[PDB]
Structure formats: C-alpha cells, structure tokens
Symmetry: D2
Subunit: 305 residues, 4 copies
C-alpha cells in the first residue's frame, strides 16, 4: 500500500468507445438485437463497447438483466480486437464491488464505475468507495464523473490521488461540461487517461491530451466517431476537428431530452431497432422533439447492418 | 382523501458491526413516540436507503410498523426508487405489512422527463390503496417535479395527496398551494419549516427531529393551531442546529450528533458514507451544547 | 465608531413600497405622466414610492435624468403621508455616495442602494462600500441584494455587521429567491427591517418578520398590494395570504421576461401610459409573451386614475 | 472584414494616491509591446472601468493610442456599457482618438433579452467604422449572448467580427465555430486558452499577460502556427498562476502580483474594490516564485 502508483504499469482501455443502448421488446431485453447491434459497432472501427451504462438504462435493469448484457457483450467481441469496459458503478459500495467481481470473472476487459448518485458522498467517502472497488479486482478501473445526474463531483485531487494510490484506476470519463477541469487533470497528472463523456466536446478534450471517448452518438454513427477519435490520436487535428464540427448538430439533438431518450428515438427512426421501448420512468419523447430529431438526422449518412 | 400530516421524523438507521441493530431502531422510535411525534419515515435518504439491501429495507419497515402499533403515531414508509418496477414493488411491500402510507422520492440518476415522472408516480399509485406522498429533492436526484406535474398527479390519482419539498424554493410552495389548495404541503427542509407551514403547509419530515423531537413537534403543532408567534420563535431558535446538521451531506452530521448524545452505540455508516472530519465533528458538538436533548 | 448600533434609534422606511416605472415619450422622460402615475399610487394606500430603481431603468438613465425623477417623486408626495426612498445605488462607491448626498439635500426620506454590479466586490469591499455611503448621509440606508442581476451577494454576516456598525443602515431588500437567508437574517438580527423584493413571496417573507415590500406588481395593482402588506403587519395572516395566492398569476407573468419589460407591457395594455417605450438594451417583449401578459391580466380589476 | 487577433492584454489601471498615474500606465504598456504582445485592451473589467470617471476613461484610451503609435501593437479600447447610448458614445469616443477597435461587454445589471442584445450591438456597430468584438461574461453581467445572437450580429453588421468568451463553456465554442467558421473566437479565460484556440480560436484577451506577457504571447503564437504540442505545454505550465489570479474577484489578485513584482508603486484599488486578505496575499506570492517575471 503506497502512493507511488502513477508511473507503474497500468492497463488502459482507450480509443473510440460506445455506451450501448439496451433494446427492449415486449418487456424483456432483446438479447438477439443486442448481439446484432454490437456487431454493427465492431464492423465500423470501434475500439471498445460499454455495456449497461447510463445509455443502457442501468437504473431500471435488474441485477439478473445487468448480468446478461455483460455476458453478451463479452461473447460477441470474443476473437475480435474490440474490448469490453463493462458498467459496474452503483451508489452503494457493496453493490459496486459485487458487480466488479462479476465482470472480472466473466470476461470483461475493464470496468466503468460511476460516482455514487443520490446519497452525495463526501470526498473521503469517494476515496473510500473507489479504493474498495480497486482492491476488489485486478482489471482496470475507469471513473465516471457526471455531476449533473449524480449530485456528486469527484474532486480533481480525489481523481489524482486515487490514480496514484490505486494500481487499477487509470483515468476518468468526464461528463461535466467543465473544460477547465480537463486542463486541471492533465496539467497535474499527465499519465492519466482522460476520457470524454460529452460528444459535442469530443475533439477539444482529445486535443488537450484526452485518449478516448465514451460516446452516445456512437450508437447511430459509429464510423464517424471512429474516424474522429483515431484522427486525434494520430495527432491529425485538422481532420478530427472537421468531423467534430459536422457532428455538432446531431451531438446536441441527441440530448434535447435526458439521455438515453433521444438516442433511442434516432435508432428507431433509422430502423436499427424494431420498437421504441423504454423502461419507466423513461418514456418516448414529446411529439415536437420527435420531429426535431428526425429533421436533423436527414443530414447524415446512417450505416445499416 | 386520507392524509398523513404533522411532525414526522426521517429515521436514521443505526448500525452495529456492519449489520442493522434492530433493537436500537425500535428504541429510537419509542423515543420519537413519547415526544409528540405524529409519524415516522423509515429508510429514507436519512435512513441510508441506498446502501441497505432489499431484505434489510423490509425489516426496518416491519420494525417501524410494530413499534407504533397501539399508538397514535403513523408509519410513512420509504418506498422510492429510480426504477418504477422497483418502486412499485416497495410500495406493494409497505402495504402488505401494515404501513399507513409511502414516501416516494423522485427518480435519481436517470433524470426522467415531466411525462416520465407522471407515469412513474401513476404506476406507484395504481399499485396500492393507501396514501402516497411525493418527494422532490432536486439537489440529489438531478430532476425536479413540476408544480403542474404534482397538481396533475394529485387530481388524477386518489392516493397521491401532497409533496415533501426539499428545494429551498418558497416561490414553488406558493405556486403549489395557490393553484391546488386541497394539497398537503410537507416540509423537507428544517431551516424553513415555519415559513412553509406559514403559507399553508401542514407538516414536516424532519432530520432534526431525530435529535430534538420535542422541539420539532412543538414547532409543527404551534403553526397548525395558527400560533405563528410561538411557532416562529422555535424556528429561529433551531436555525443554528438546523444548519450544522448539513455541514456535510445528510445523514453524516445528524448521526454524529446522536452518537455524541449517547443515543446510539457506534458511529458506523455504510460506504460510500463515512464519519466526518474531526473539524466538523468538533463543530457539531459545540452547537449541541446550546440545546436540550431529550433522553430515553 | 462602535459595533453596538443595533438597538439605538434607527429611522425606518417600511410598509407597502413601489418600484416606479419610468415612462418615456419620444426619447425623453414623460415628467408629467410620471407625476400622474405617482398620484395614482398615493390614492391607493401606498406607504412609499421608490424612484429610479431597477424597475425605473437606472442603468439607461443619465445622471441628469436620475436627478429629475427624484425631485419629482419628492414633490408629488410633499404634504402627504407617502415617503420617498430614492434609488441611489451604483457599482462605483464615489457614484453611490454622490447620489446619496443629492437625495438627502433634495428631500428624500431615505435611500435604496443596490449592491455593486459587474465588478463583483468581495465581502470586505462591500463593507467598505456601504460604510462609506452610510457615513456620507444622515438619512436611512436600505441595502438591496439581487444576486441574479449583480453577480454579487451581500453575506448575512455583512448585512448584520453593517446593521450594527452603521447608524443609518436599518435593513435590506432581498431579491434572492432564498427564504433560508430570510430565516437566517431575522433569527440572528431580529431588530432589522427585512424587505421583500419578490412579489410572489411577499407574504411568506412578511410572515417571518418582514416589515415591508418593494413591489413591481404594485405598478399595476397598488390597492391589492397595499391590502396584502397592511394585513400582514396587522398580523392578519389569513387575509394577507388570501391576497398573495390571488396575485401569484400576475406576480409571475410580470417576470416572463427581465424586469421591467413585462410590467411596462401591462401598463401599456391597461392604458396607464400612452406609449410602450424602453431604452436600449431594453425592448418590447416577444409577440407570444405580449399575448401571455394580456391573457392573465383579464382576471384582475385594474384601477384607473 | 478587418480583425484584431493574437495575444492581447487586459491592462490593469495603476493608481497613485487616488488618481490615475498616467506615467506608469505608459510604462506598463511599453513592457507589453517589448514582450511580443499583439494588442492591448485598455479599461476593461481588469482595468476597473466601473470606478473610473468618464474623463479618466478617455485619457487611458488616449495613453494606449500614443504608446503603440509606430509599433505593430494595436489598441482595442474598452467601450462597453449597460446603457446603449453610453456604449455608442464610448464607441464613437475610441474611433475619433485613434483606436483600432473596441471591446464591448454585454450589458450588466439590467439583463437584456436576446432581441435587446441584438439591437444593443447593432446600435454600436452603426456608430463606428472600425471592428467591434463582442464580450460575453455571464458570471458578471447576469445575461448571456446566444450563439445565434452572436452569429446573427456577425452577419448583419460589417464591424462585428467575433467574441471574447469568458464562459467556461467549451461546448459553446464548438457551436459558434461550427456554424460560423469565419468568426474570430477570442479567449477571455486564461486557464482554457489552449483548448479554445485548439478548436479554431485565433487569440486571447489575457489577465495573466499583465504579469507574464512573454509566456502568454508564446502560447498564442505557438497555437496559431499549429504547434499544439508546444502551445499546450505552456498552457499546462501556466495553470497554477492562471487560477491563483482569481482566488478573489479580478483584478484584485493580479494587481497584487504586479505590486509584489515591483512593476507598480502602490496597491490601490477604487472602492468597492480593496486589497485582498493577507492569507490570499501570501498565496499569490508563493505561486509567483515558480514563474519567470519579465522586468522593464
Ligand atoms: N443494475 C443493477 C440493479 C441496480 C439498479 C438501481 N436502481 C439500484 C440502486 C439502489 N442502491 C438499490 C438498493 C435498494 C435498497 N433500498 C437504490 O438506491 O435503490 C441503481 O443502481 O440505480
Ligand atoms: N443613473 C446614473 C447614471 C449611472 C448609469 C450606469 N450605467 C453607470 C455605471 C458606470 N459605473 C458608469 C461609469 C462609466 C465610466 N467607465 C459603468 O460601469 O459604466 C449604471 O449605474 O448602471
């Protein structure tokens, strides 16, 4: 137990990553359309898939359904280059550690663990929470900071102190709308993998040292997000910003309403899923926003299966 | 409509070596009964509902039911969740085991729309035949239940009868009670207990009640008897402890206060909750020296 | 110079008070409609008038026009019970002290001085700013806290420490949407006059010890606001809340857009002023909000001249 | 369109016994010229425009004009106001006295609507024939200039050519430059200087430039020559001073820094601005020990 973990060997999960929607069909999860949807991601240059995130409706899934979609994501990318960074966060520490051990023993390449929501833990509670998770598994741990949906914020000091104190934790996914914090993170701890959780600012984050994205827009346009990320990591910022500017219109209309309501609306209107099913308290969008998503979608080339 | 109002307590959940100490829970509730409390709210956010298991959540509702059997005190069990099928299961859980009503927090983390909140609460209301009190706490859920959403649920379902506002928005409480005066507005913010009940509010769901149940009971009962002079004097006299109980995220400071008053054995939280800094630990006991803490 | 000023003799300006709109006619100020508009306030039970506030467009008036409307407000209430609490705040201390000395030497009964805007002074700068103003005049000083429009907040400690340290400062006008701060102020310093700057919460503030309001809705319905305030100060809270609940609909539609754009729209549609003139960067409201204000207005009885 | 871009400095206004010390102002600007600065912005928010008189505002624009005559450095005079007739008078003020352009802050205190901002800036643009750069700082004005409002002003008036964003909203800077790529996006936030110019920004209006003009000039010129590796290294190396210069409201910390570097005689502000606490006074000098401060 030491504080000098930053430059030791860390396994990382970077590149273009996708927060997978969870398709539903007559109350259950469409396990077969789930497999089809990920194969589409594999064939479009995607580097990793994130099952059961916020886009996958982690709140409304049961413990037994959460398990099925981690196993399916692992098995469709077996034999391929694509990695599985499974969502295993929870607002209870015993729940987040219990999910982390499942993902490790079932083939996941890493885990995404969101900051505890609703109960608003303190900075010492956050250290304690993630330290228990990191010492529970031997696979990489990527923090997820989304203060607008959890009520909590992982301090830059906590993120940097966990990076140095834990040997699995190697970075964070920032959904903060705070580019200042992204300069703060990479100017004081440049050995960390800063990941974008906001599609509109995918490129500005990657131009300051970011090493990957966990996209929601990826669900609809995996090829374009794949090109944007790989252009930036190849230090080809002119072409990476060219893609980023052309994606802004769809990057924001996919959040006209709370994620993942608009993105599943796009996939229904693009024929990529049969039915427009959400699980309450999520519901189909307003009739005005339904028309707004379909209008902006006509300006992009949607790849099929 | 059947309603549950008055001075109510968001019960802390005492722990002893990692497990729920069921015997101190009953003891702590008996202290609430004997100090003028009108109802108890088991396993809310103050009760650490997030870190409890599904099987521990049930036992603490059953313990509350049996400790108030034969008394005037009602049991308003916490049954909220960010998944509607989970909240409907817990609402049906409380009904079959003797609870008089349920408190249901707005879904957290997933940020439902106004239409999602409507269908979320309607599904809960269609699961039970006992009153349902909404709970709006935007600072911890990321979403807010519109005044119109609250009013439209109040009129469409016969169990939904009010809301427990923890918003710091006195403007919203005039909006609610000027357009729907039959509604029971309950305070979820101890510092503004009097101003809310001062505009037509009919009860509180207190965190301070845990430590000073007699004073919070007096504040509420004075206001509903329209003795606002005496109800406001207690509110002004409680402001110092009402704010130091949130120096850190609830329920970290109040569980510290009850440990320093000998009312619980151990200062255990369940992660990601933890004991406070010793600087805030010293501040809470200093504020406690100015108040009269009722014992057992 | 001492810290024990709280219980010494303080002159106060309380009751129902009105932030007067400044009518314009072909670029100039309508000095004659200004006099007419205040006489309407006098004849409807109003206790005091606030010339050249935020509702009077203090930002766009010149120094010479600011002067004229303080003199006119003083002279139309000469011989009457109505008091003049002139607006004399500014983001520069030499400007706020210069205006305070004018109001004193020209017949004002007190001054309203807003917290400095734009330059965001610190709490020590705020003490310093108001202490210089208070020691410049011998007439009462009422602070004005509106953090949503200045970028600054007067700490409860600063307001209480200025109340005790200054012999003219006797209270504050809170436009904060923070009822917690109104419990904070009156629970630690009950000898202060807490004034409401938010019409929707006029009664809840008066029920916790508030002693008056500085209303914008007063411009249209002075009689109803006059009844609400005097009912509360006579401890008749049932009838004061009865008025407050019936005023909520107009209390909020008068802020569909930034004050004082909606309130002058109401007075144009009620025939109380000839022309709908603002001074840039203020402008007439959107055509949709113009219809919204007129629709809600039909449910109230508008007293004429 | 004529544009004013590059590394720019929001000039502090030094005072000496209550009056503007006009001789140190010229001296401080000469230091800016000789350290690679492209333009100077007199009497902004960093220059204490609020507490200056109308006659002092003019002299500090004229001093800036004469100190950069014969040099490559341009003068982008501050001419914003919350009243449009005042801002048009100041815009016409700068034009008749040799300024190359004007910086115009969004109206403060009175919170104009999006239509009000449009007519506010159009009136300023129709008063002068030199470029006009908008200034959006929502944390100090209470209002925000919509991306569409900025784009609609850019296309309708031939002097308006960009905006200086002090918003901490990198999302808005993608919105602006993806829908209007001919626009000159200028940074008004020193900490995010590189990420903004990294997305197509073409200059900065710095507060840190006052103390370290050579480093800020190098950061900007590296980025526009597309050497983002070297431009980002300077940005990461400046973060510590970029944040301690806002421990208190600007320009209180930076005026403290220049006093501790001997570059100004007296640490005078004009009320309601005042010297910082000695705790923050000690913190600013500690951060200064890690940077190389260019002298005269
Ligand atoms: N995907 C696996 C199921 C978890 C779903 C859950 N609703 C559970 C959150 C929970 N901690 C459940 C514990 C219930 C005990 N009261 C909660 O806060 O309700 C969430 O994480 O949001
Ligand atoms: N009602 C009397 C005229 C004041 C109008 C003024 N725009 C002036 C604010 C001011 N301090 C004026 C000083 C101008 C010197 N640069 C400002 O910030 O512009 C305001 O107070 O908002």
């Amino acid at each position: 137990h030491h504080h000098h973990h930053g430059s030791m060997d860390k396994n990382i999960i970077i590149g273009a990553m996708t927060a997978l929607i969870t398709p539903f069909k007559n109350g259950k999860v469409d396990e077969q359309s789930y497999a089809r949807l990920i194969k589409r991601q594999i064939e479009n240059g995607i580097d990793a898939v994130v099952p059961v995130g916020t886009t996958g409706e982690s709140a409304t899934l049961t413990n037994e359904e959460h398990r099925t979609c981690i196993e399916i994501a692992v098995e469709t990318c077996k034999g391929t280059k694509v990695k599985v960074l499974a969502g295993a966060g929870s607002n209870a520490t015993h729940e987040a550690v219990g999910l982390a051990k499942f993902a490790k023993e079932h083939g996941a390449d890493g885990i995404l663990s969101v900051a505890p929501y609703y109960n608003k833990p303190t900075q010492q509670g956050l250290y304690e929470h993630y330290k228990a998770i990191a010492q529970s598994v031997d696979i990489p741990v990527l923090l997820y900071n989304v203060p607008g949906r959890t009520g909590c914020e992982i301090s830059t000091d906590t993120i940097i102190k966990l990076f140095r104190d834990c040997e699995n934790i190697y970075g964070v996914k920032e959904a903060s709308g705070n580019i200042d914090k992204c300069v703060d993170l990479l100017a004081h701890e440049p050995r960390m993998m800063l990941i974008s959780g906001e599609d509109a600012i995918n490129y500005p984050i990657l131009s300051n040292g970011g090493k990957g994205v966990i996209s929601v827009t990826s669900n609809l346009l995996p090829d374009m997000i794949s090109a944007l990320t790989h252009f930036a990591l190849d230090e080809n910022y002119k072409e990476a910003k060219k893609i980023n500017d052309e994606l802004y219109n769809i990057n924001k209309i996919l959040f006209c309403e709370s994620n993942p309501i608009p993105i599943k609306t796009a996939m229904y209107l693009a024929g990529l899923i049969e039915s427009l099913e959400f699980r309450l308290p999520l519901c189909s969008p307003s009739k005005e926003n339904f028309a707004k998503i379909e209008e902006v979608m006509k300006k992009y080339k949607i790849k099929g299966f």
